[PDB]
């Protein structure tokens, strides 16, 4: 699956990994993330991510 980078801090959202600690199971596509999900490292909104 796809990876997306936070343009602010360099965190990579990997759809295969999800973000379980913040309520996101593995295999969740970036577009399926809740509108109020943010970068777990720097707090940036989804708008600041770019698909790799
Ligand atoms: Fe970030």
- Tell me: is residue 22 an annotated ligand-binding position: no
CB-based contact 8:51 (threshold 8 Å): no
Alpha-carbon span 1 to 35, nearest angstrom:
20
Stated in angstroms to one decimal place, the resolution of this structure is 1.7
CB-based contact 40:12 (threshold 8 Å): no
Domain 1-52 -> CATH class: mainly beta
- Tell me: is residue 50 an annotated ligand-binding position: no
Per domain, the residue ranges of the chain are: 1-52
Q: For residue 47, how far is its CA from the centre of ligand 1 (angstroms)?
A: 11
Alpha-carbon span 10 to 34, nearest angstrom:
20
Q: For residue 29, how far is its CA from the centre of ligand 1 (angstroms)?
A: 17
Q: For residue 39, how far is its CA from the centre of ligand 1 (angstroms)?
A: 5
Method: X-ray
Give the pair of three-digit tokens for residue 43: 């707090």
């Amino acid at each position: 699956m796809a990876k997306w980078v936070c343009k602010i801090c360099g965190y990579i959202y990997d759809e295969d990994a999800g973000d379980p600690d913040n309520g996101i199971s593995p295999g969740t596509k970036f577009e399926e993330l809740p509108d109020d999900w943010v970068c777990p490292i720097c707090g940036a909104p989804k708008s600041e991510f770019e698909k790799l």
